[PDB]
Design a protein around this ligand. Structure first.
Ligand SMILES: Nc1nc2c(ncn2[C@@H]2O[C@H](COP(=O)(O)OP(=O)(O)OP(=O)(O)O)[C@@H](O)[C@H]2O)c(=O)[nH]1
Ligand SMILES: CN[C@@H]1CCc2c(ccc(O)c2O)[C@H]1O
Lengths: 287, 244, 55, 337
């Protein structure tokens, strides 16, 4: 009954929160403490870890109680604040992934000019720019009345403090979806296609050179990287676009379910982006 | 002391700053330059190759396509033992120059071995060194013209000096430039496969070898070096991640 | 041959004859020195935190 | 020639027997009732950064503050131990250097490398910093170590078997020391100015006399190359480290080794050896990314120094004895107290 549903969901949300916070803090401490892992590339990784730590600490808890209680206890100023924090964290993480992909592409396809282009001071500018861009689409319209729409059922929950829910007009939903998801997605696809072509070419050359005396790795490395992100974040943005266009097509429960499916991707990122042996060695030292 | 000591610190502190700026300026120049270590056996056309590549230790600096390369050649030691090899750990690649023509020739002292066999032993010693685990090698099998003349219309036979030539069968898949007699092709491919046998024995994928065929009067060597360095850096970056 | 061997021969002869003492006396002298200079050594026993310059 | 060859054998037998006769009792048997020094804990107090490449050599000044280091980027940097700021930065003619030294007077610094030239840089003029005062050339092999007898004269060791003593004022070899059959890798000046010892790729180590030029004695205990050497503060004993894990202690008066230091776990080579002021502690660097502290008298390990990301290639102890400094193939230096 209510005991059964409430009890089981309790054992899952707590595990999710603990796993996210533990993984992110472990990665951040590993980067900070040891000078060996300090590198130009790892600054993007620590930015991603910080953003996911903020999201796991902030949005998951308060949101968890809202579904379980069936009511929102905090007042009107905090519902908007929580929504803004959610949008900020999601956008920042998704864009940091694309920044990492572009850095890898430049490192691989231009071996001679990699050292000159990217420097320690240059990376800070990019990270600040992406954080400002993420903040601009998150806090500025949410703090204002731009996000709110005119639907009758909606006008109510903006008037009543009891129901905290997300109702938006078509323009903001479309703009946020395009800014957050699709533009990074096409860039990642093109980048990884070119990188895979380069890897295949090098393997063919080495096979021609030394085949007589002597593709799983590339497909295993990319398939994982692209597939986890696509599976975690693809359905939510398409249903977010759909539900505004078509009336009553998508139920609220399915929307919340896909939104929560999107959240859990934060825990997987430390596993995907920190498999290097240096990361393993360091973890043993503190642990 | 007291007020007086503070006075020294500001100049001294200005002083640390005067230096740090110069160090930061020099680091940018240091990062870009690529260093290649040039090594080989005596009388293997070393000077000819280094001269054609560009117009106790000798260093030559040249640039190709807005990229700076720095070269080191250390012939002063004359030493069979070699612990100066420990220094050259950060080199991008090692250029090895061996004379393919001198198969039927004798080292002057003790008649211990043919000149090529000693070169093969030296290459084996360098390849398996503990410090040089992640450094690649580029081979210039120099004196290609003389080998053809010594094989065609030459009394000397590869069979006597190298017994394994009879058992070896040339692969028909790989072919030379048009017009060459098959015999010289068999000779050069025997010379190359012998080096590749040691090269691929214990590589483990970290470092590779690129065998090239070169002659005295040529200018395409520098382009070959540039392309090989580019390939080495690309392969190192690919292996750094999990793709390759 | 004579030049090389003689040059050594002479050497070995020079180092052949030299006064020697038992290892016991040398060990006792080393122990006496180490015991005498034990207090002055800062590494063996840490000094006051304010005393050392680095800390 | 055979008769001369025959003589080379009888002399060896007499020396070996004479040495065996004097072995009244082992050193360990003498010292067993002596209480151990105990656990030793050391922590980093300063970290010095700024070098572009790895570090081969360093040498503390005669004062407890000053310090000098060398690297392949071509720069000598004279640091300040107390406040960790760089006083001088000097470029170099060649990018390969393997040694450095600091004069007892505190006015000159000498550096050498793969090029068979020894350079002497002068800190005193202070106009446009350092300038190359004296260039010393004439060897046929790379230089491995350089130390100052005095401001006027310097003694060097070469990759060629010969060692030489120079006069800076004229730049010519006053005396030449010969007798090794391999490369000479380290020499240390004794607290007594007259004598210094050498260690070479051949397992033999030798003791020379600067005035006459004659090798006083020879020690051949080791099995492989010797990479480091140092004196006991008394001046009557010296210790060596080799490629194998063994580090031994020799005695001048007894003309034979007294004790060997080794452990079952350790298998990497040695690159540095130094003593404390009292002489109780023997500090040795290792190819493995660590440093071990040995108790000379008890042959029992006491502590471990760790924190470097690569092999340690330099080590030294201040004259006052407060701190020990180590340099590694990582660009950074560390001060341990
Ligand atoms: N016919 C012919 N002669 C060549 C060829 N390559 C080199 N030689 C000759 O062989 C010589 C070899 O160069 P060396 O002068 O021995 O080179 P090195 O650098 O002094 O040699 P090391 O003793 O190794 O330092 C060249 O100077 C030419 O005279 C070639 O392809 N064909
Ligand atoms: C309340 N949850 C929000 C609702 C809308 C939204 C999310 C994430 C990224 C966006 O660009 C959005 O427009 C979701 O996390």
């Amino acid at each position: 009954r209510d005991e059964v549903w409430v009890v089981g969901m309790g054992i899952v949300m707590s595990l999710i929160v603990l796993a996210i916070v533990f993984g992110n803090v472990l990665v951040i401490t590993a980067i900070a403490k040891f000078e060996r892992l300090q590198t130009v590339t790892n600054y993007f990784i620590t930015s991603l870890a910080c953003a996911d730590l903020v999201m796991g600490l902030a949005v998951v808890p308060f949101g968890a109680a809202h579904i379980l209680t069936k009511t929102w206890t905090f007042g009107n100023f905090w519902c908007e604040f929580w929504t803004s924090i959610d949008v900020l964290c999601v956008t920042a993480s998704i864009e940091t992934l694309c920044v990492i992909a572009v850095d890898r592409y430049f490192a691989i396809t231009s071996p001679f000019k990699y050292q000159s282009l990217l420097t320690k001071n240059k990376a800070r500018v990019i990270i600040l720019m992406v954080w400002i861009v993420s903040g601009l689409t998150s806090f500025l319209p949410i703090q204002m009345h731009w996000y709110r729409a005119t639907h009758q059922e909606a006008i109510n929950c903006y008037a009543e403090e009891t129901c905290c829910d997300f109702f938006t007009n078509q323009a903001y939903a479309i703009a946020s979806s395009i800014v957050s998801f699709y533009v990074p997605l096409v860039i990642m696809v093109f980048v990884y296609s070119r990188v895979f072509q380069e890897a295949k070419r090098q393997l063919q050359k080495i096979d021609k050179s030394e085949g007589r005396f002597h593709e799983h790795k590339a497909l295993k490395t990319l398939g994982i990287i692209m597939g986890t992100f696509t599976l975690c974040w693809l359905p939510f943005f398409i249903v977010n676009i759909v539900h505004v266009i078509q009336d009553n097509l998508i139920r609220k429960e399915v929307y919340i379910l896909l939104n929560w499916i999107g959240y859990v991707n934060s825990g997987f990122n430390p596993l995907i982006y920190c498999r290097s042996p240096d990361f393993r060695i360091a973890f043993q030292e503190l642990l | 002391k007291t007020e007086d000591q503070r006075n020294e610190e500001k100049a001294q502190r200005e002083a640390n700053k005067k230096i740090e700026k110069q160090l930061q300026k020099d680091k940018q120049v240091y990062r870009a330059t690529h260093r290649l270590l040039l090594l080989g056996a005596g009388e293997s056309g070393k000077s000819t190759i280094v001269k054609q590549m560009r117009i106790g230790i000798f260093e030559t600096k040249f640039q190709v396509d807005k990229v700076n390369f720095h070269m080191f050649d250390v012939g002063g030691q004359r030493d069979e033992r070699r612990k100066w090899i420990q220094c050259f750990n950060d080199v991008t690649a090692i250029i090895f120059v061996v004379a393919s023509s001198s198969y039927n020739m004798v080292i002057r002292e003790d008649n211990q071995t043919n000149r090529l066999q000693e070169a093969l032993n030296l290459f084996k010693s360098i390849w398996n060194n503990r410090w040089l685990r992640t450094i690649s090698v580029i081979l210039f099998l120099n004196k290609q013209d003389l080998l053809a003349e010594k094989v065609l219309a030459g009394k000397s036979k590869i069979e006597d000096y190298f017994p394994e030539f009879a058992r070896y069968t040339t692969p028909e898949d790989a072919t030379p430039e048009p017009g060459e007699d098959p015999r010289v092709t068999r000779a050069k491919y025997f010379i190359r496969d012998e080096f590749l046998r040691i090269s691929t024995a214990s590589g483990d994928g970290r470092h590779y070898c690129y065998p090239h065929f070169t002659c005295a009067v040529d200018t395409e060597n520098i382009r070959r070096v540039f392309n090989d360095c580019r390939d080495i850096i690309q392969r190192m970056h690919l292996r750094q991640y999990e793709l390759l | 041959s004579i030049a090389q061997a003689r040059k050594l021969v002479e050497q070995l002869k020079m180092e052949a004859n030299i006064d020697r003492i038992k290892v016991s006396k040398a060990a006792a002298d080393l122990m006496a020195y180490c015991e005498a200079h034990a207090k002055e050594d800062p590494l063996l026993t840490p000094v006051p935190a304010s005393e050392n310059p680095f800390r | 020639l055979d008769q001369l060859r025959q003589e080379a054998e009888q002399l060896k037998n007499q020396i070996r027997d004479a040495r065996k006769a004097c072995a009244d009792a082992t050193l360990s048997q003498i010292t067993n009732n002596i209480d151990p020094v105990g656990r030793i804990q050391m922590r980093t107090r300063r970290t010095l950064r700024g070098h572009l490449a790895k570090i081969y050599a360093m040498h503390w000044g005669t004062d407890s503050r000053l310090l000098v280091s060398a690297s392949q980027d071509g720069k000598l940097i004279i640091w300040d131990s107390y406040t960790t700021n760089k006083v001088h930065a000097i470029p170099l003619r060649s990018s390969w250097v393997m040694t450095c030294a600091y004069a007892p007077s505190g006015n000159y610094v000498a550096c050498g490398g793969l090029d068979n030239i020894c350079s002497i840089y002068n800190l005193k003029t202070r106009e446009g910093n350092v300038r190359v005062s004296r260039e010393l050339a004439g060897h046929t092999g790379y230089l491995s170590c350089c130390r100052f007898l005095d401001d006027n004269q310097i003694v060097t060791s070469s990759g060629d078997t010969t060692c030489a003593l120079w006069d800076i004022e004229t730049g010519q070899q006053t005396t030449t020391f010969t007798g090794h059959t391999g490369d000479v890798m380290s020499l240390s000046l004794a607290p007594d100015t007259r004598l210094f010892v050498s260690g070479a790729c051949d397992a033999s180590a030798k003791l020379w006399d600067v005035r006459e030029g004659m090798c006083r004695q020879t020690f051949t205990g080791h099995e492989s190359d010797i990479n480091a050497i140092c004196f006991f503060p008394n001046g009557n004993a010296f210790a060596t480290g080799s490629d194998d894990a063994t580090c031994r202690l020799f005695d001048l008066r007894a003309d034979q080794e007294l004790m060997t230091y080794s452990h079952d776990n350790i298998i990497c080579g040695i690159t540095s050896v130094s003593f404390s002021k009292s002489g109780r502690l023997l500090l040795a660097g290792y190819d493995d990314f660590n440093c071990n502290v040995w108790d000379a008298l008890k042959a029992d390990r006491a502590g471990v120094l760790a924190g470097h990301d690569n092999r340690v290639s330099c080590l030294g102890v201040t004259d006052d004895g407060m701190a020990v400094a180590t340099g590694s193939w990582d660009s950074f230096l560390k001060i341990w107290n």
